[PDB]
Design a protein around this ligand. Structure first.
Ligand SMILES: *[C@@H]1O[C@H](CO)[C@@H](O[C@@H]2O[C@H](CO)[C@@H](O[C@@H]3O[C@H](CO[C@H]4O[C@H](CO)[C@@H](O)[C@H](O[C@H]5O[C@H](CO)[C@@H](O)[C@H](O)[C@@H]5O)[C@@H]4O)[C@@H](O)[C@H](O[C@H]4O[C@H](CO)[C@@H](O)[C@H](O)[C@@H]4O)[C@@H]3O)[C@H](O)[C@H]2NC(C)=O)[C@H](O)[C@H]1NC(C)=O
Ligand SMILES: *[C@@H]1O[C@H](CO)[C@@H](O[C@@H]2O[C@H](CO)[C@@H](O)[C@H](O)[C@H]2NC(C)=O)[C@H](O)[C@H]1NC(C)=O
Ligand SMILES: *[C@@H]1O[C@H](CO)[C@@H](O)[C@H](O)[C@H]1NC(C)=O
Ligand SMILES: *[C@@H]1O[C@H](CO)[C@@H](O)[C@H](O)[C@H]1NC(C)=O
Ligand SMILES: *[C@@H]1O[C@H](CO)[C@@H](O)[C@H](O)[C@H]1NC(C)=O
Ligand SMILES: *[C@@H]1O[C@H](CO)[C@@H](O)[C@H](O)[C@H]1NC(C)=O
Ligand SMILES: *[C@@H]1O[C@H](CO)[C@@H](O)[C@H](O)[C@H]1NC(C)=O
Lengths: 51, 242, 213, 122, 42, 77, 122
């Protein structure tokens, strides 16, 4: 099947992934309130163009 | 946390086949030792010997150094810790001072200076060393009586008269009514025959709702009497309640 | 036996009591250990104290003991009613066998009595077609456990065919006994009413059957 | 010398199994279709080894074998006497009964070490 | 009434189960916590 | 009086039931049946010249030949 | 008990971040296209762990957490007061400022241990 299932990206031991819990975040620069997480939220591989 | 089974024994003459067995449950059979002890009415509680099922080391008292033989069997597992074995004892040279109940009791723990001290005990097998011949039990039914007119309590049971040797078992409804039961000791008459009584206490309002079947079982004579005790009484202090 | 306890001992309720366990140097207490069992007569015992002071599994912290170089002692604090029974010590080692003592009967004082509930039974109809006659005189629910049964043939003391059990402790922490009379049906026949006497602490309770009725 | 062998004291009394503690630790490490199998196993070996060694490190012990700490024995963790355990039971039996409350104890033995270190220095 | 036997061998795992019946696999977990009358040094 | 204290122990004879990734072993003579890789071994670790067995005295364990894993493992291998 | 969490004290003052040092060490180890990825990561884990553990070993410490040594603080390594550091700064800030001279200090903390051992024994 080609169904895009939610895939999470987790880090090895001795590594970390930083989640920017900022509503009005434009992607770049100092994110004021930061949290830390091992795995990302469920991101499914929906592949498309213009949308 | 398991209970050890002890095997009831025949009355025996100064010469006859002698053995008593003992079964186990709920423990690791080869760790704990096995101690034997016998309580007669003339010399008190006396320790006989002990034996370990794993090694097989028996240490006996010098009073049984040449007439008692002890034996252990092989373990039959159930789980990784619990198991089920058995052990026998044959006491030869049957004197009359041997008359009286006797027991099995296993050790307390597996190691130490107190490895074998008997922690877990058994039920009790009774001897009667006697040339006297076996006699069956005369099971009579006992009439209920008034224990309290204001509270509404009565009592009814069975009477086991003229049996030899000890003991005689008495159950109820094949094991249904165990609450309120009181069995009395047997006295030995001037002839050689015992007699005991037994009475369970049950309420007076139960007439056609419960069946009362006293099951007197005597093993040395191979007899099982199933007496039906009548719930209708003859006391003038309980008739006020019916 | 070679190990000697005390004859008996008493102690009130909510109080303590001691029991001694002494003997010669061949059994106690140099290079020996002591254990303590609550052994109700006719019932299976219960290990109380092992290795001279260590309470067996499940044994309440009320009990304790101690060993001197010549005698050991048991102590039951906050004395309970059911504790009124026989108690046995023993001196053991790792190698040799264990030898019991002589026996101590604990007389817990300060306990309410109960009047005996006696009941006498005449010969049955199947026993009079046998033909036998046995008077069954049951005693129960008395405390303390000491009663004396005397029979009288039409208000005349009989000295033939007296059956008497010793008093035994029930499951409700009382005592009970059972007497009988084994005389011919004609031994009572001439005697128009037969009784059963139960003396208890002076107070005597008696029950008579009138076999004319 | 007494050398029953690797795991030889798994069925003996826990006191008796304290006598053989170096043999089990020794053999724990034991330092293309088949290749991936063998290699995978050989990695999980060092991982299973370094997890337990990590714990034995962050409990301040760091020192192989028996190690004491100042944690009180909450009696509800299968209350038995000492003679009731070290003369009677075996380690499989034991860890089975204690398995329920194990994780909590691992958690407690964490935190107490750290404070010790901290104020010990200073 | 009575019963008869017929050769099978339908699946190949049983062939290994013939000689592999004596063996089982176990994790070693050498973290044994116990009580004793000991306090860590001051 | 005394209060008990937990003490930590390494190398305790305690296991648990599990499965894992097992690996082969061949006789030292077998790596001389060369025949250009007789089917399995070409890459397998030799078997110990001095193998050992340790009889676990007093020990009891519950096997289950049907609920094994080295059978599923061996079969897929 | 105070448990902010793994890395929870990365933005707190360095004195306050000394309070949580066991949590970060605990989770550091955390003991076919996907397979090579996972396995590679799982090896680099134990390697990154054993490098720092190797250093913490050959500095004589060996003992997890705060460890003292007899190295003098060359004041040129960002001279500030103690109250100027352990009541004010955070560990990211700190290691940034000290990052320049870090390697030299790692080198010095090597050699002094060895001599200590040597003549200590003898
Ligand atoms: C498997 O499990 C079983 C049972 O759990 C283990 O067997 C038990 O081992 C323990 C030791 O850990 C034993 O406790 C010891 O008991 C001995 C025996 O008592 C003496 O007296 C006997 C009768 O008088 C005599 O027959 C005995 O003879 C044996 O001993 C020697 C060889 O050792 C030789 O004579 C024979 O070949 C017999 O084998 C024996 O002399 C007792 O001596 C010990 O007391 C000392 O040690 C304790 C500390 O352990 C100390 O506190 C004491 O003060 C004293 O100094 C000790 O009590 C136990 O008897 C065994 N049997 C049981 C419990 O039934 C077995 O070991 C386990 N296997 C393995 C591999 O662990
Ligand atoms: C293997 O054998 C054992 C005993 O030899 C079997 O266990 C007993 O099985 C009977 C019924 O077959 C039960 O009544 C017993 O209670 C069992 N004993 C125990 C300790 O569990 C077992 O079932 C057999 N299994 C197979 C697959 O042959
Ligand atoms: C257990 O053993 C100790 C040994 O000192 C003893 O003090 C205690 O009374 C025993 N019993 C209990 C229940 O702790
Ligand atoms: C200690 O044991 C008691 C027993 O009920 C339990 O309730 C309690 O939670 C335990 N202590 C801790 C810190 O969990
Ligand atoms: C462990 O916990 C389970 C339930 O979680 C319980 O059934 C079991 O009895 C516990 N173990 C002991 C030894 O009580
Ligand atoms: C100590 O600091 C001074 C400051 O300039 C520096 O020059 C010197 O090299 C340092 N010491 C060492 C051993 O490098
Ligand atoms: C660290 O060194 C760089 C140049 O190597 C320098 O620009 C920087 O200022 C230094 N850091 C501090 C805190 O001075």
């Amino acid at each position: 099947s080609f169904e895009p299932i939610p895939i999470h990206y987790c880090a090895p031991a001795g590594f970390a992934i930083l989640k920017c819990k900022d509503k009005k975040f434009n992607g770049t620069g100092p994110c004021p309130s930061v949290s830390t997480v091992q795995c990302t939220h469920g991101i499914k591989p929906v592949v498309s163009t213009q949308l | 946390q398991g209970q050890l089974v002890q095997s009831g024994a025949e009355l025996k003459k100064p010469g006859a086949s002698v053995k008593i067995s003992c079964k186990t449950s709920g423990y690791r059979f080869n760790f704990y030792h096995i101690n034997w002890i016998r309580q007669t009415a003339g010399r008190g509680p006396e320790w006989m010997g002990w034996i370990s099922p794993y090694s097989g080391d028996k240490n006996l008292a010098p009073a049984f150094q040449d007439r008692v033989i002890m034996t252990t069997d092989t373990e039959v597992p159930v789980t990784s810790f619990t198991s089920t074995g058995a052990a026998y004892m044959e006491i030869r040279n049957l004197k009359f001072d041997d008359t009286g109940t006797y027991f099995c009791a296993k050790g307390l723990l597996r190691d130490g200076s107190s490895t074998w001290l008997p922690y877990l005990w058994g039920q009790g097998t009774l001897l009667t060393v006697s040339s006297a011949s076996t006699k069956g039990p005369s099971v009579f039914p006992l009439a209920p009586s008034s224990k309290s007119t204001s509270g509404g309590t009565a009592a009814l049971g069975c009477l086991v008269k003229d049996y030899f040797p000890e003991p005689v078992t008495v159950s109820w409804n094949s094991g249904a009514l165990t609450s309120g039961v009181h069995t009395f000791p047997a006295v030995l008459q001037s002839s050689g025959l015992y007699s005991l009584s037994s009475v369970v206490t049950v309420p007076s309002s139960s007439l056609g709702t419960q069946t009362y079947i006293c099951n007197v079982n005597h093993k040395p004579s191979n007899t099982k009497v199933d007496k039906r005790v009548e719930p209708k009484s003859c006391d003038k202090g309980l008739e006020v309640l019916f | 036996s070679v190990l000697t306890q005390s004859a008996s001992v008493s102690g009130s309720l909510g109080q303590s009591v001691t029991i001694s366990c002494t003997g010669p140097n061949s059994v106690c207490c140099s290079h020996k250990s002591i254990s303590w069992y609550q052994w109700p007569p006719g019932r299976a015992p219960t290990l109380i104290i092992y290795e001279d002071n260590e309470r067996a599994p499940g044994i309440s912290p009320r009990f304790s003991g101690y060993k001197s170089y010549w005698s050991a002692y048991l102590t039951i604090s906050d004395l309970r009613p059911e504790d009124e029974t026989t108690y046995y010590c023993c001196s053991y080692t790792h190698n040799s066998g264990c030898v019991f003592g002589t026996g101590t009967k604990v007389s817990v004082l300060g306990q309410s009595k109960a009047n005996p509930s006696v009941t006498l039974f005449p010969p049955s109809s199947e026993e009079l077609q046998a033909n036998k006659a046995t008077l069954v005189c049951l005693i129960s629910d008395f405390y303390p456990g000491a009663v004396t049964v005397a029979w009288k043939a039409d208000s005349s003391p009989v000295k033939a065919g007296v059956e008497t059990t010793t008093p035994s402790k029930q499951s409700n922490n009382k005592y009970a006994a059972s007497s009988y009379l084994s005389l011919t049906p004609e031994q009572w026949k001439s005697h128009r009413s037969y009784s059963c006497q139960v003396t208890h602490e002076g107070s005597t309770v008696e029950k008579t059957v009138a076999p004319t009725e | 010398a007494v050398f029953l062998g690797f795991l030889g004291a798994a069925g003996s009394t826990m006191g008796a199994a304290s006598m053989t503690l170096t043999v089990q630790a020794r053999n724990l490490l034991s330092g293309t279709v088949w290749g991936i199998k063998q290699l995978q196993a050989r990695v999980l070996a060092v991982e299973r080894y370094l997890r337990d060694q990590q714990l034995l490190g962050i409990w301040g012990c760091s020192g192989k074998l028996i190690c004491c700490t100042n944690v009180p024995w909450n009696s509800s963790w299968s209350n038995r006497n000492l003679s009731e355990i070290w003369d009677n039971m075996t380690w499989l039996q034991w860890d089975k009964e204690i398995s329920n409350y194990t994780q909590i104890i691992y958690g407690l033995l964490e935190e107490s070490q750290n404070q010790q270190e901290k104020n010990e220095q200073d | 009434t009575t019963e008869t036997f017929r050769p099978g061998g339908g699946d190949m795992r049983d062939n290994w189960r013939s000689e592999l019946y004596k063996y089982k696999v176990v994790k070693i977990e050498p973290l044994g916590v116990a009580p004793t009358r000991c306090k860590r040094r001051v | 009086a005394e209060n008990l204290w937990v003490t930590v122990y390494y190398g305790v004879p305690v296991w648990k039931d599990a499965e894992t990734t097992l690996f082969c072993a061949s006789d030292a003579k077998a790596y001389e049946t060369e025949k250009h890789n007789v089917w399995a071994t070409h890459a397998c670790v030799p078997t110990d010249p001095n193998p050992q067995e340790i009889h676990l005295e007093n020990v009891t364990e519950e096997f289950n030949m049907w609920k094994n894993n080295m059978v599923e493992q061996m079969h897929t291998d």
